[PDB]
Amino acid sequence: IPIPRPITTPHNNFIIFNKVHRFLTYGLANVVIPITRTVNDVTYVDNFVITSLGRLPVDRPFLYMNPNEFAQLPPGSCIEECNVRVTAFTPRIAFQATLNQNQFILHATGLNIKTQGVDVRPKEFQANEPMVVSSIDELGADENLFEDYVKEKSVPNHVPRHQFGIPYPLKNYFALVLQQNGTADNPGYECLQSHVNEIRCNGPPGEIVEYNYKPQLGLIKKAIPAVYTGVPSAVGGNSTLSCPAGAGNSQYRTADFTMTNNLRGDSETFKDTVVSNWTIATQIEKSQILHAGAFPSYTPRAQPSLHIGVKPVHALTTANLDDNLNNANFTDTQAYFIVEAACKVRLQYPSIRPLFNGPNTIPDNQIYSSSTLQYTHAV
Amino acid sequence: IPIPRPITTPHNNFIIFNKVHRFLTYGLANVVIPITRTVNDVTYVDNFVITSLGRLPVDRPFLYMNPNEFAQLPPGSCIEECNVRVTAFTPRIAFQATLNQNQFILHATGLNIKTQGVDVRPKEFQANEPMVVSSIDELGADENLFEDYVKEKSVPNHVPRHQFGIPYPLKNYFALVLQQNGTADNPGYECLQSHVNEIRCNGPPGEIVEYNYKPQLGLIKKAIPAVYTGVPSAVGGNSTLSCPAGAGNSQYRTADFTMTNNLRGDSETFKDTVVSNWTIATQIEKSQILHAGAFPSYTPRAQPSLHIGVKPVHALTTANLDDNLNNANFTDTQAYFIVEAACKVRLQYPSIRPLFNGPNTIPDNQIYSSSTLQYTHAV
Amino acid sequence: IEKSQILHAGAFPSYTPRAQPSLHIGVKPVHALTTANLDDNLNNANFTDTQAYF
Amino acid sequence: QQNGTADNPGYECLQSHVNEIRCNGPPGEIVEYNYKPQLGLIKKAIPAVYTGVP
Amino acid sequence: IPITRTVNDVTYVDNFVITSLGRLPVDRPFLYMNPNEFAQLPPGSCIEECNVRVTAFTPRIAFQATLNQNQFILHATGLNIKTQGVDVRPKEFQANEPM
Known part of the structure; x- marks a missing residue:
């Protein structure tokens, strides 16, 4: 009358990485760098306004790890x-x-979504010196943008930063901007301060602020899929009812006047397993759905700055001219994460899972940047 | 006056597998299967004596896991x-x-080393029926021997056993043997019972015995090596003193008369990193040295049997003739183990460790079986 | 002197250690961008002293 | 040693x-270094004197 | 500071990377004593x-x-064996200057 047979399905796991970089911002001139937008008829020039503010690839993995010795071997792993x-x-x-003055210091947390x-x-x-006077559109550039940073390769003459x-x-x-040229019916800037x-x-x-993020769908590798059967040709397919x-x-849209x-608007597309991600935006949730779902997504972005030491004395009316400041900010990070060996069918390799398996994606794969125009998420 | 910079070296891990097979032995005839050994002059015939005893690839991994979905992805891992x-x-x-009788059952634990x-x-x-009458030398056969068992592939017509x-x-x-032919100056058998x-x-x-083993060097994959530097040509080499x-x-030997x-005897060879092990003897310690050392090694091997129901009645003098017995033994296992992501040099992939790194091996790679003649270790 | 010495027959594998002191380095990069390193001087008065027993 | 081609890994995590x-x-004050040299010999040593088979 | 290693065919150049790090003849006796008045007379002696x-x-x-900045200071212990x-x-x- 006894029972005999025991077995089981999965095997999960964890791991983390520690890194400590040294960075520096500079009391970048708090000025207007207007850029001439031109259509068939050039107008509506965007006036960018610089801020000493910096940015930390916090949303990007390399910031947290060994280049390859680290973006290595975690098939299906998530952070x-x-x-x-x-x-x-x-x-x-x-x-x-100038001689002496009151250098103020500062930082702000991913104001990116709430700052246009x-x-x-x-x-x-x-x-x-500190004088933004040309600003290049670090945007629509998306694995090359934060790609020089990657040197922390072939050229030994970039002493591995870390x-x-x-x-x-x-x-x-960072900076704020406004499209105001046609006429004078264009409001002012956002209350940055x-x-x-x-x-x-x-x-x-x-020490300043401690940034912390628990990425919704922090996938950073291809995921294992499952194995259907039961109604065959080489690659069968079944379609079942639901409610x-x-x-x-x-689904997504918006537009302005x-x-x-x-x-x-709204635009609709279909769901199918993703088959890819070296070091790209970890905050991989706005283009990923695991198995059928209903989610509207968001993201955050730390930045550190030393404000700016203005140098105006006995000089009156339309004046800005500034002083330099090199400041040693001291970041360091922790990247926690999942790992996996969820296997399924004995003979197949190297990893599997079920039918309610890895996240599905947009057929034609769309992917979104974040160095230009957030609203509530990557444009 | 504060301290700032933190970092670190390794990252270890664990995992296990569970399996439950059903096997069966049979009350194999407790007889003598003599085999004719012949040199330039044929003599010294080895008389094997069978025993209902079985054997469990306990010392082999497949017994514990998914074929590939399991002998999968653990670079440098050990059990x-x-x-x-x-x-x-x-x-x-x-x-x-015959009708009824007293069927005795039995097993013994890796008597292999202490049974010649x-x-x-x-x-x-x-x-x-149960009648060993030919015995084939399941030996010197070493990844093909316990290789049919592996079917638990291409042929779906072997319902995956498990x-x-x-x-x-x-x-x-199992069985015992003796080389006794030349003349009559050859002693008897070992006290098997x-x-x-x-x-x-x-x-x-x-339930019967619970076998347990903590393999000395249970390696089952290639291991990560290190990275020298400091005195260069493409592949430098330095030789330093020691005591x-x-x-x-x-080192190894023996011989008889x-x-x-x-x-x-003794024979001496040199140390260099191993570069290999699908499913082979896990008890991988007699051919492995990690970093310089001094070890003499050993191993164990469970087996299960149902003895044998003899059928001699009113029949006298030189008699053995036997009865069949199919018995449902019920094994199941647990394979514990290490895992690893010990990385070293940022840019190299995919795993490293130091100078005092993975086990060194015999230049010309020797490897030893265990289905023939143990003494105190694989012949 | 241990890696080349054996007193009377033995079996030893040997090792050694080596202290060092530094003041890091004061980098001087301002409003200057891309492939840049150029540095500042620092003279620092380290103050060792020792004891040799025997 | 990295010149032949580009299959040469990076540096060690010095930091x-x-x-x-x-x-x-x-x-x-910083660190106090301390060492008990295994065989800290620093001179010739005295030997012995055999006899008995001359 | 890369140095050109050359065999019959010059290649595999060693790229040294400097560190402000110093070294103390800690492993050497003079660091501890009178030159001769000290490396004197201890026949058979050991330390x-x-x-x-x-x-x-x-x-x-x-x-x-430059003017002012955050000078960090440091030391490390015989990393020599564990640093290649x-x-x-x-x-x-x-x-x-420092160059």
């Missing part, structure tokens, strides 16, 4: 959590004619 | 522990002229 | 074995 | 123990155009 903490200090002024302006603009300079624990400057600064924080860091202001109710269709919001 | 438990029951006699005889002999039969939870017979039975255990299992004798003392040299022990 | 400080002023 | 303690301070910057690179390289300079 559930991760976080960082800047902890910077006192600004390195220089006079290449974007982090594009690593620009060009002038005869007055490993050797070497300082660094960031090349992407509102989303940010000043300090009068006497010395080493020590929707509008099964998700990678003269800087004023008004329009919203 | 530290593993164990099983037979738990069999009442023998299935049949009369194809080997598990070879899956043989041939006769006109009297998965479907199907019974099975074992094809390797001494290493084994009888039962008068009324019914379902329930031996005779650094291990894969007329069934009597007397000789022992 | 990993070292320690930074933001020594405001006189960071005072 | 069983020995140790040191650095205890340094604030860095002496100079501008021979070596303490060689007392080198040469440039037009930009």
Whole structure:
């Protein structure tokens, strides 16, 4: 009368990575870099306004790991959590004619979605040091953008940034922008100051904010699929009833009229397993659905800055001219994650799962950047 | 005055597998299967003596796992522990002229090293059912031997043994042997009975012995090596002093004179990283050295049997003739193990470790079987 | 002196250690962009002292 | 040693074995190194004197 | 600081990477004693123990155009065996001081 036979399905796992970089921003001139947008009839010029603000590839994996020795071997793996903490200090002024002043320091957390302006603009300079004077559209560039950074390769003459624990400057600064040229019926800028924080860091202001994110669908590899059977030709296919109710269709839209919001479309497409992602936006949720679902997605983006030391004395009316500050911000991170060996059919390799398996995708694969125009998610 | 920079080296891990097979032995005739050994002058014939005893690829991985979906992806992984438990029951006699009798059941644990005889002999039969009458040398055959078993492939007409939870017979039975022909100066057999255990299992004798083994060096994959530098040409090489003392040299020997022990050689070779192991003897310690060392190695091997129901009645003098018994033994196993992502040099892939790294091997790679002549280890 | 010495017959594999002191480095990159390293000087007064027992 | 082609990995995680400080002023004292050399010989040693078979 | 290793066919150039790191003849006796008045007279003598303690301070910057900054300080213990690179390289300079 006893029972005998025991067996089972899965086998999950975890692991993390630790990294500590040294970066630096600079009291970038808080100015207007207007760019001439031209159609059949050139007008509506976008006036970008720079901010000393920086950006941390926090949303990108390389920031957290070994290049390859690390973006290595985790088939089907996802990163559930991760976080960082800047902890910077006192600004390195220089006079290449001011002396002393109150250097304020600052940072703000992924204001990216709630600030319409974007982090594009690593620009060009002038005869007055910190001086954005050309800003290049760091946008629509999406695995090459944050791709020079990747050097932390072939050229040994870029002392591996990390490993050797070497300082660094960031090349992407934030800014806000406005399309105002046609006539004068264009409102002002957003209350930037509102989303940010000043300090009068006497010395080493020590540690700043600790960023933390639990990416919704932090996938970062192809996922294992399943194995149908029961109604055959080489590659069978069955279609069964259900109660929707509008099964998700990678649905999205919006549109505007003269800087004023008004329009919203929707576009619908179909669901099929994804077959790809070296180091790309980990916040992989707006283009992924696992198995049929209903989700509207979002994302965050830390940044650190030293404000800016203005140098106006006994000089009156339409004046801005500034001072330099090199500041040693001190980030470091933790990338937590899943791992897997969920196998299914004895003979097949190397990983499987069921029918209610890995996330489905948009047939024609769409993928979205984030260095230009967020609203509530990657444009 | 604070400290800033944190980082680290490794990342280890574990995992296991569960399997439950059904096997069966049979009250194999406890007889002498003599085989004619012939040199330039044929003599010294080896008299094998069969035993109902079975054998469980306990020392081999497939016994514990998914074929490929399992002997899959664990680069550098090792299996530290593993164990099983037979738990069999009442023998299935049949009369194809006896009726009832006292069927004794039994098993013994890897007596292999302490019993000179080997598990070879899956043989041939006769006109009297359980009847070893030909025994083939299941030995010197080493990834093909326990290779039919592997079917638990292309031929769907071998209902995957496991998965479907199907019974099975074992094809390797143990026996003892002696080389005694020239003249009559050859001693008898070993006290086999001494290493084994009888039962008068009324019914379902329930569970039997639980085998357990913590393989010394249970490696089962190529291991990651390190990366030297400092004195270059394409592939540099340095030679530094030390205090031996005779650094291990894969050293071994022995030899005999007329069934009597007397000789022992030694042979010495050099150390270099191994570059290989699908499913082979997990007990991989007699041919492996990790980093310089001094070890003499050993191994174990479970087996299960139902003894044998003799059928001699009113029949006198030189008599053996036997009865059949099919018995449902009920094994199942657990394979524990290490896993790894020990990485080293950022840019290299996919796994590394240091200079005091993975086990070194015999230059010309020697590998040893275990279905013939143990003494204290694979011949 | 242990990797080349044996006192009276033995069996030893040997090792050794080596302290070092540094002041890191003050980098001087401002408003200058792409493939840049150029540095600042620092003279630092380290203060060792020792004990040799025997 | 990396020149032939581009199949040569990167450097070792140096930072990993070292320690930074933001020594405001006189960071005072740092590490105390200590070593008990295995065979710290530093001179010729005295030998013995056999006899008995001359 | 790459150096050109050359065999019958020059290749495999070793790229050294400097570190502000120093070295203390800790493993050498003179560091501990009188030259001769000390490496003197101990026939058969051995040194069983020995140790040191650095205890340094604030860095002496100079501008021979930066002003102030966060000078970090450091040391590490005989990483020599666990770091493949070596303490060689007392080198040469440039037009930009530490170089």
